[PDB]
Design a protein around this ligand. Sequence first.
Ligand SMILES: O=P(O)(O)C(O)(Cn1ccnc1)P(=O)(O)O
Ligand SMILES: O=P(O)(O)C(O)(Cn1ccnc1)P(=O)(O)O
Ligand SMILES: C=C(C)CCOP(=O)(O)OP(=O)(O)O
Ligand SMILES: C=C(C)CCOP(=O)(O)OP(=O)(O)O
Ligand SMILES: [Mg+2]
Ligand SMILES: [Mg+2]
Ligand SMILES: [Mg+2]
Ligand SMILES: [Mg+2]
Ligand SMILES: [Mg+2]
Ligand SMILES: [Mg+2]
Lengths: 358, 353
Amino acid sequence: LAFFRNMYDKYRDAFLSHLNEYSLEEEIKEHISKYYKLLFDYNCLGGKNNRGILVILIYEYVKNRINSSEWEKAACLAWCIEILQAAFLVADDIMDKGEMRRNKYCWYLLKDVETKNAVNDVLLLYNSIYKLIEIYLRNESCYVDVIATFRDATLKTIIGQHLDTNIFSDKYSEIDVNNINVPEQPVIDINMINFGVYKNIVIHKTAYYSFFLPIVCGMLLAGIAVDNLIYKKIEDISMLMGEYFQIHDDYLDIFGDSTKTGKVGSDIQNNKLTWPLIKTFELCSEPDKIKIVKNYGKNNLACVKVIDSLYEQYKIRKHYESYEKAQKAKILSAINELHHEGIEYVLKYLLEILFTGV
Amino acid sequence: FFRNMYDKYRDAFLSHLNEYSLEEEIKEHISKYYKLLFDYNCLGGKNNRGILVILIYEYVKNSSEWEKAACLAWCIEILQAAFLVADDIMDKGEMRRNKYCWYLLKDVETKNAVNDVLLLYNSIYKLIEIYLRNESCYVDVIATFRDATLKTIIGQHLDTNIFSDKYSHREIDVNNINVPEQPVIDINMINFGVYKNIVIHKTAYYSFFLPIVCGMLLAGIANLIYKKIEDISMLMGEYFQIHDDYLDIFGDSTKTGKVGSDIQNNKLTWPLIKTFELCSEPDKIKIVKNYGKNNLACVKVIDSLYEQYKIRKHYESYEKAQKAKILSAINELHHEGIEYVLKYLLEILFTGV
Ligand SMILES: O=P(O)(O)C(O)(Cn1ccnc1)P(=O)(O)O
Ligand SMILES: O=P(O)(O)C(O)(Cn1ccnc1)P(=O)(O)O
Ligand SMILES: C=C(C)CCOP(=O)(O)OP(=O)(O)O
Ligand SMILES: C=C(C)CCOP(=O)(O)OP(=O)(O)O
Ligand SMILES: [Mg+2]
Ligand SMILES: [Mg+2]
Ligand SMILES: [Mg+2]
Ligand SMILES: [Mg+2]
Ligand SMILES: [Mg+2]
Ligand SMILES: [Mg+2]
């Protein structure tokens, strides 16, 4: 764990090093190294580090101890999930018109960067992962399985980000290849406001890259055979934990303190299908439905305020806290079926520090 | 038969998505969206890169072997697609292959397009796994796509930032979200050394080195010929990009499929550098004053300078001398089969087929 924290530089600088081998003029090489050193630092640091720490812990509690060449490979994988997070979050804030990420301006918003650099930079962060895994793990037998898990995790996430972004779109509620002029007015689709659709999305956008991937990396490296039925159990727990983590997130979009969360709430105005939106539709009077249809998805104070107060009226904070309690018990029940005492402690521990880090 | 086989790889990938734990109506929605993403962006081009895989493979060496080569061939066409979607966002593109750029469609927008670039990119590796996973060259193939992709990313970064304030002692300003940069050229960067740097990275690696290498690995070449091919590919990428820069100024968008944008986007182009080489100090001053401005009278001045200094002429002469340098490099390959394909690629490069 202190190996992880202290070895950020190592992996950052191993990748910067690879590009310094490019056939470029020395001045150009210097400019690239400055730009890219910032892109990693700005975008990979400042968070809780829960995914990376998970890789480290799973790895340790699966093995009976671990040399520093072994740690160097696990912390590699751990940082690569933290680079994956970076890439995803850079793109998310473009998609969601983010203002603040980890208490600092979103990367795409910087005048030195903009959306043109940010898009190129997502691709860079994402490909650095695979270069770093080649550097530290090409000779391991889990090597192909590790790179497969990253790419399949990433594909699931890309699908869920697509659904998060289009579930209410006109495309769905034939795509028009002739319209570049007539913008679509954000409206909610009431046929999509149920927990079934919500789960399809949050499992895909959150659960795979955030829980499944880092646990599987820890296990693949520690050497659990890919045909072991523990991986399926692990997948089922990841889905429970993923939906749990994402609901807490949706909850913070309205109830959090932007100085503590490090980001600014935007789901109402960005027309998202969130747990609060679904719970309220489940509970609210028929005229309040007409009221959510009218006011949701509008970057307008009085419109957002209507929604906030319907969430105040329908006691969404209380319904959340009773979801947290019921879902946590559900996760713990599944963890207790794992028949691996090492992984169980880790996942119990994770579940405690999930919202805070540590 | 290259193009016959397109649906096979697209639908193989769409089948992969269809296995996701998603409600049936949602799977239907995603099949429609993604089929269009692939059809819209993979189809319509010269397919030079895919064809080059196929041909290199044939000339280094049954229908199951062709299933693997066409797979790689279509994966480079998918990478072309990913890079172009991203490039048209970055370059404020208007048309690509005589249709509106994907990012502009009201049903897509930049928010979708950014995600879709990653979808396209990642689709490649799933396809190579489906078709080549038990090939001994599997890991070498995925490493080649990956490294050529890193190279292209760096090159696109340089193309997009070479004249920028951050490069012109001081740091990226992490507190500036409000004061937009006023684009201006950096005269210190207007040289062919810097231009070859950008151009081998953003074009030559994925456009030449990658398709040729794909066919050579699969045909089973383990070998100092790889460095000779690298060197030719760089020669070819430069030649090809200089042609592209040429078309940006002198082309017809109904024939190029795309609307020229380099002057207003502040690109370090071959016509820029060739003009800077040959012009007077007061035209240098005109260039500084007018380049990188999305303004008619400004692009007009630059365009007028390109007429005045006979850039069309200088390009025709460049094309002649550089084709000759590529053929001289090709003749040093001492591989009859690869040599034939490259000579022929060189003949069809600007037109296709
Ligand atoms: O709410 P999102 O899904 O946009 C978010 O959680 C990011 N994200 C992206 C994928 N999964 C989660 P963030 O609120 O941090 O902006
Ligand atoms: O001039 P570009 O680099 O933008 C281009 O050639 C595309 N491209 C992208 C990378 N290398 C070349 P296009 O003129 O097609 O928009
Ligand atoms: C994936 C979700 C739900 C939000 C971002 O995740 P984290 O809260 O784990 O982000 P950092 O700790 O990395 O800032
Ligand atoms: C790498 C360059 C110069 C961009 C255009 O590529 P092509 O001219 O190969 O484009 P398509 O045939 O794929 O349309
Ligand atoms: Mg977001
Ligand atoms: Mg989002
Ligand atoms: Mg959120
Ligand atoms: Mg470009
Ligand atoms: Mg372009
Ligand atoms: Mg061009």
